[PDB]
Design a protein around this motif. Sequence first.
Motif, PDB file in Angstrom:
ATOM      1  N   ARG A 285       0.875  -1.191   0.000  1.00  0.00           N
ATOM      2  CA  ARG A 285       0.000   0.000   0.000  1.00  0.00           C
ATOM      3  C   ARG A 285       0.904   1.230   0.000  1.00  0.00           C
ATOM      4  O   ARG A 285       1.783   1.361   0.846  1.00  0.00           O
ATOM      5  CB  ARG A 285      -0.895  -0.064   1.230  1.00  0.00           C
ATOM      6  N   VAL A 286       0.680   2.124  -0.953  1.00  0.00           N
ATOM      7  CA  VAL A 286       1.485   3.360  -1.078  1.00  0.00           C
ATOM      8  C   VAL A 286       1.116   4.274   0.099  1.00  0.00           C
ATOM      9  O   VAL A 286      -0.073   4.521   0.317  1.00  0.00           O
ATOM     10  CB  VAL A 286       1.268   4.054  -2.413  1.00  0.00           C
ATOM     11  N   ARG A 287       2.126   4.747   0.802  1.00  0.00           N
ATOM     12  CA  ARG A 287       1.926   5.779   1.867  1.00  0.00           C
ATOM     13  C   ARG A 287       2.331   7.163   1.344  1.00  0.00           C
ATOM     14  O   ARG A 287       1.641   8.131   1.654  1.00  0.00           O
ATOM     15  CB  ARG A 287       2.746   5.382   3.090  1.00  0.00           C
ATOM     16  N   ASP A 288       3.365   7.288   0.526  1.00  0.00           N
ATOM     17  CA  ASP A 288       3.715   8.582  -0.091  1.00  0.00           C
ATOM     18  C   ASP A 288       4.553   8.349  -1.333  1.00  0.00           C
ATOM     19  O   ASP A 288       5.129   7.239  -1.491  1.00  0.00           O
ATOM     20  CB  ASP A 288       4.523   9.517   0.825  1.00  0.00           C
ATOM     21  N   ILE A 289       4.549   9.326  -2.226  1.00  0.00           N
ATOM     22  CA  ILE A 289       5.425   9.339  -3.418  1.00  0.00           C
ATOM     23  C   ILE A 289       6.031  10.724  -3.497  1.00  0.00           C
ATOM     24  O   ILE A 289       5.251  11.709  -3.420  1.00  0.00           O
ATOM     25  CB  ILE A 289       4.615   9.047  -4.685  1.00  0.00           C
ATOM     26  N   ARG A 290       7.340  10.811  -3.662  1.00  0.00           N
ATOM     27  CA  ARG A 290       8.038  12.092  -3.827  1.00  0.00           C
ATOM     28  C   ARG A 290       8.818  12.055  -5.130  1.00  0.00           C
ATOM     29  O   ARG A 290       9.417  11.011  -5.421  1.00  0.00           O
ATOM     30  CB  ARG A 290       8.938  12.402  -2.621  1.00  0.00           C
ATOM     31  N   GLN A 291       8.815  13.136  -5.883  1.00  0.00           N
ATOM     32  CA  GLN A 291       9.487  13.187  -7.199  1.00  0.00           C
ATOM     33  C   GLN A 291      10.284  14.460  -7.331  1.00  0.00           C
ATOM     34  O   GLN A 291       9.749  15.504  -6.904  1.00  0.00           O
ATOM     35  CB  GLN A 291       8.438  13.144  -8.297  1.00  0.00           C
ATOM     36  N   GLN A 292      11.453  14.353  -7.937  1.00  0.00           N
ATOM     37  CA  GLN A 292      12.244  15.499  -8.415  1.00  0.00           C
ATOM     38  C   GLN A 292      12.465  15.362  -9.918  1.00  0.00           C
ATOM     39  O   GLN A 292      12.862  14.257 -10.334  1.00  0.00           O
ATOM     40  CB  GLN A 292      13.591  15.583  -7.702  1.00  0.00           C
ATOM     41  N   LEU A 293      12.224  16.414 -10.689  1.00  0.00           N
ATOM     42  CA  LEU A 293      12.491  16.448 -12.154  1.00  0.00           C
ATOM     43  C   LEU A 293      13.594  17.469 -12.377  1.00  0.00           C
ATOM     44  O   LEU A 293      13.422  18.658 -11.946  1.00  0.00           O
ATOM     45  CB  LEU A 293      11.249  16.863 -12.946  1.00  0.00           C
ATOM     46  N   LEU A 294      14.637  17.076 -13.067  1.00  0.00           N
ATOM     47  CA  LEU A 294      15.759  17.929 -13.458  1.00  0.00           C
ATOM     48  C   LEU A 294      15.997  17.754 -14.949  1.00  0.00           C
ATOM     49  O   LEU A 294      15.741  16.692 -15.545  1.00  0.00           O
ATOM     50  CB  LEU A 294      17.030  17.579 -12.685  1.00  0.00           C
ATOM     51  N   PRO A 295      16.507  18.801 -15.617  1.00  0.00           N
ATOM     52  CA  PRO A 295      16.907  18.676 -17.006  1.00  0.00           C
ATOM     53  C   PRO A 295      18.200  17.890 -17.122  1.00  0.00           C
ATOM     54  O   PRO A 295      19.103  18.021 -16.286  1.00  0.00           O
ATOM     55  CB  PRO A 295      17.162  20.127 -17.444  1.00  0.00           C
ATOM     56  N   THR A 296      18.303  17.149 -18.193  1.00  0.00           N
ATOM     57  CA  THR A 296      19.571  16.628 -18.712  1.00  0.00           C
ATOM     58  C   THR A 296      20.173  17.690 -19.617  1.00  0.00           C
ATOM     59  O   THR A 296      19.418  18.470 -20.215  1.00  0.00           O
ATOM     60  CB  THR A 296      19.384  15.263 -19.373  1.00  0.00           C
TER      61      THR A 296
ATOM     62  N   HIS B  23      21.008  23.888 -22.957  1.00  0.00           N
ATOM     63  CA  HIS B  23      19.541  23.709 -23.065  1.00  0.00           C
ATOM     64  C   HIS B  23      19.210  22.246 -22.683  1.00  0.00           C
ATOM     65  O   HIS B  23      20.079  21.363 -22.763  1.00  0.00           O
ATOM     66  CB  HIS B  23      19.000  24.019 -24.470  1.00  0.00           C
ATOM     67  N   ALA B  24      17.991  22.038 -22.221  1.00  0.00           N
ATOM     68  CA  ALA B  24      17.594  20.694 -21.758  1.00  0.00           C
ATOM     69  C   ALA B  24      17.597  19.735 -22.942  1.00  0.00           C
ATOM     70  O   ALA B  24      16.905  20.027 -23.977  1.00  0.00           O
ATOM     71  CB  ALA B  24      16.243  20.750 -21.152  1.00  0.00           C
ATOM     72  N   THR B  25      18.293  18.606 -22.817  1.00  0.00           N
ATOM     73  CA  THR B  25      18.259  17.543 -23.835  1.00  0.00           C
ATOM     74  C   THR B  25      17.202  16.479 -23.452  1.00  0.00           C
ATOM     75  O   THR B  25      17.109  15.485 -24.152  1.00  0.00           O
ATOM     76  CB  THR B  25      19.632  16.891 -23.992  1.00  0.00           C
ATOM     77  N   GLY B  26      16.467  16.694 -22.382  1.00  0.00           N
ATOM     78  CA  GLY B  26      15.567  15.711 -21.775  1.00  0.00           C
ATOM     79  C   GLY B  26      15.473  15.931 -20.280  1.00  0.00           C
ATOM     80  O   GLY B  26      15.769  17.037 -19.805  1.00  0.00           O
ATOM     81  N   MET B  27      15.062  14.909 -19.552  1.00  0.00           N
ATOM     82  CA  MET B  27      14.694  15.043 -18.145  1.00  0.00           C
ATOM     83  C   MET B  27      15.129  13.777 -17.409  1.00  0.00           C
ATOM     84  O   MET B  27      14.962  12.651 -17.941  1.00  0.00           O
ATOM     85  CB  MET B  27      13.178  15.179 -18.098  1.00  0.00           C
ATOM     86  N   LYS B  28      15.641  13.955 -16.200  1.00  0.00           N
ATOM     87  CA  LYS B  28      15.904  12.888 -15.231  1.00  0.00           C
ATOM     88  C   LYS B  28      14.880  13.054 -14.121  1.00  0.00           C
ATOM     89  O   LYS B  28      14.796  14.119 -13.519  1.00  0.00           O
ATOM     90  CB  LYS B  28      17.337  12.954 -14.702  1.00  0.00           C
ATOM     91  N   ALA B  29      14.098  12.020 -13.856  1.00  0.00           N
ATOM     92  CA  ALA B  29      13.148  11.973 -12.733  1.00  0.00           C
ATOM     93  C   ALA B  29      13.713  11.046 -11.678  1.00  0.00           C
ATOM     94  O   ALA B  29      14.249   9.953 -12.029  1.00  0.00           O
ATOM     95  CB  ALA B  29      11.811  11.467 -13.193  1.00  0.00           C
ATOM     96  N   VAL B  30      13.586  11.417 -10.412  1.00  0.00           N
ATOM     97  CA  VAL B  30      13.809  10.479  -9.289  1.00  0.00           C
ATOM     98  C   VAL B  30      12.511  10.401  -8.527  1.00  0.00           C
ATOM     99  O   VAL B  30      12.026  11.459  -8.098  1.00  0.00           O
ATOM    100  CB  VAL B  30      14.980  10.860  -8.382  1.00  0.00           C
ATOM    101  N   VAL B  31      11.955   9.201  -8.412  1.00  0.00           N
ATOM    102  CA  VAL B  31      10.707   8.925  -7.671  1.00  0.00           C
ATOM    103  C   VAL B  31      11.034   8.019  -6.491  1.00  0.00           C
ATOM    104  O   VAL B  31      11.651   6.952  -6.666  1.00  0.00           O
ATOM    105  CB  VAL B  31       9.656   8.286  -8.567  1.00  0.00           C
ATOM    106  N   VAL B  32      10.607   8.417  -5.314  1.00  0.00           N
ATOM    107  CA  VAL B  32      10.735   7.595  -4.086  1.00  0.00           C
ATOM    108  C   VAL B  32       9.333   7.267  -3.619  1.00  0.00           C
ATOM    109  O   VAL B  32       8.554   8.191  -3.318  1.00  0.00           O
ATOM    110  CB  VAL B  32      11.544   8.300  -2.992  1.00  0.00           C
TER     111      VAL B  32
END
Lengths: 341, 341
Positions: free
Chosen positions: B216-227, B246-255
């Motif tokens: 059961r999910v209790r929380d989700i946290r995300q950071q989005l940064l440009p590549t 300039h951004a070539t794309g995006m790196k997401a980290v999801v916890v």
Amino acid sequence: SKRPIRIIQWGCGLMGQTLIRTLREKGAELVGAIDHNAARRDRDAGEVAGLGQSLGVRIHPPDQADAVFREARADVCILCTRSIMSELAGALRVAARHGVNAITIGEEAFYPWTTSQALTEELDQLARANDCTLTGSGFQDVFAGNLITVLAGATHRIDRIVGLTQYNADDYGSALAQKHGVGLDPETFAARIGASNSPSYVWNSNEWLCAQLGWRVRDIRQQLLPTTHTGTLRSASLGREVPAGHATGMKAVVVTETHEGPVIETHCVGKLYAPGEVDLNEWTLRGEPDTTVTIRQPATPALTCATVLNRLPQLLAAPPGFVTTDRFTPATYVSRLETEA
Amino acid sequence: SKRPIRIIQWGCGLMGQTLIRTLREKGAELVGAIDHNAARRDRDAGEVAGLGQSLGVRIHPPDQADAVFREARADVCILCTRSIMSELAGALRVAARHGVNAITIGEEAFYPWTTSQALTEELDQLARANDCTLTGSGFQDVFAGNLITVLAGATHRIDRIVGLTQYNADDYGSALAQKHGVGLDPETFAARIGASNSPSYVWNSNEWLCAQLGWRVRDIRQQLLPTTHTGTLRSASLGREVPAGHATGMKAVVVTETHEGPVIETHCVGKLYAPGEVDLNEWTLRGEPDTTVTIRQPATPALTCATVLNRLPQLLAAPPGFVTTDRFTPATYVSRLETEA
Ligand SMILES: NC(=O)c1ccc[n+]([C@@H]2O[C@H](COP(=O)([O-])OP(=O)(O)OC[C@H]3O[C@@H](n4cnc5c(N)ncnc54)[C@H](OP(=O)(O)O)[C@@H]3O)[C@@H](O)[C@H]2O)c1
Ligand SMILES: NC(=O)c1ccc[n+]([C@@H]2O[C@H](COP(=O)([O-])OP(=O)(O)OC[C@H]3O[C@@H](n4cnc5c(N)ncnc54)[C@H](OP(=O)(O)O)[C@@H]3O)[C@@H](O)[C@H]2O)c1
């Protein structure tokens, strides 16, 4: 409405000791223990498994297995003894006549339908008559099994599956070292191991893959080749040194040809390790597309035992008979080993 | 007594073209095709997919979708258009109103129950009222999904799952590059992509993992940064050069934190590639034991499309409603896409 799964451990050596500890970590209970080794008979199973506190479960020799089963009220027998169906059938017969489900890591039992057809059918009929399920599992279940079939579910066309599995003979007991010809000079190896060409673990696991994928086996060709090292290595399970130029173990190469066309080519290495060597697991599905998966230094003993435990709820729910795990959905991670009261 | 599965391809771009060819390689039939691009409307779907022999299936614009669905007598609509539920709902409503099962690669649809709850519930009720099933699949199904859950089945205790998925934005069409901020200057990326923090593909896929594992999910946290890259790179899907910085794309980290205790930490990179860069897929289950799996240069586009096709028998058999694939057994390799007379 739940209670702990009640387990008899049959075979209290290296894998059985890990299972005695780990089954309790997931909330199952040990209700009996059987082992014929003179250093383990009559000892407490907990003490043998390295627990600090006695369980009050005395290890019985297997001749007295009926008495252990009669009083244990067991749900499951876990069998960790030998590798071949002729050496497992005695214990599987006891479990089945007591209506106790059984799961063994004996490697032929992973898929014994063609290598030991008579014994498998006998046990299937006995388990059906007693409303219980017998099966084989262990490291093969994922790591020569569902790891490949889950990747196959992302594959357009399979032309070939190519596998490599390598494990450390010194992690396991004597039956494994003996099946691999550890500590034989190369002439002895050829006369004993190579000439008999007994089915290697990936003979049976490649049959399991074909069964799950819906392929029919047309032929199986196996070569058993001895491994070597340039220095002496010590076998713990055999209690002797292996001179440089003697077999430290073996590589089995199994090529499984199907009626449908695809071929499974699996290399299976069990040997003593030189300094720096590690366990290997690598599979390639060749076709559209080509996919290669690698497990980094798989903890083969831990993964063998964890897979067995995660299988237990599915074993309990399975229909009666000798039901190989190719007929199950993949093992799922279980946090609590419990069943309906 | 069997006949080919009859498919409408909605979205005839990079993945749709692969699916048009490959569905026919597995014995399905293309019975309709929808695309809004001026280079594809009124072309033959086979020619657009790179086939040399016309199929006689004319691509219609989506304002003519109802007409295609009326004449097609389809079993399945495969939807390969956009990434977010708000941009998929129009097409999914058409398929459901015609009682046609639908499978989309749009990444939010893999598990949209919490990120787009109202749309998912609306589509679930519509599909149920018209006796058909809607679902999401693609690369995540195995490669951020059942690859992990199969390995979890061999695991004694899971403390943390840590993932890395990297894919080449130039392998895909404009919806992916736009979601990843390709071609935005740093200030604009931070103000649009970073500040909105829209759910990345592994927000939804980590929810799917939790669902399949029974957590059961209790929380989700995300950071989005440009590549970024230290040179100019070219985007095919956005028809432009992206200058250094300039951004070539995006790196997401999801916890993803669970009530049960385990955490899923997933790193998700979609970007233009410099010379020598490759797709990456690597997962570690941390606990007892630690297991690391690596896919060597995954063929991400091919694996996406092959997974969708292998899912179709299960989609047809599934109960009506919006049924995410965590509720199915894993995709299995299918040789023939056929169904009942
Ligand atoms: N499927 C897999 O992935 C997998 C992985 C690991 C092991 N295995 C197999 O599982 C078996 C056990 O491995 P292990 O490393 O735990 O070996 P082990 O340390 O030798 O343990 C086996 C234990 O069972 C005893 N024993 C043998 N036959 C018995 C019988 N009929 N009744 C009662 N006790 C009996 C042995 O005693 P003695 O030593 O006195 O005979 C020993 O104490 C081997 O055949 C091995 O190849 C399979
Ligand atoms: N789940 C996965 O693993 C996975 C992997 C691959 C792709 N994806 C996603 O799937 C989508 C399609 O990817 P792709 O590489 O095939 O992209 P693509 O090449 O842009 O293909 C989509 C096609 O659909 C057209 N189109 C867009 N919206 C439409 C609509 N509502 N009705 C009719 N036609 C429409 C596009 O035309 P225009 O160019 O004119 O808009 C294009 O021809 C993207 O959102 C992508 O992120 C998911």
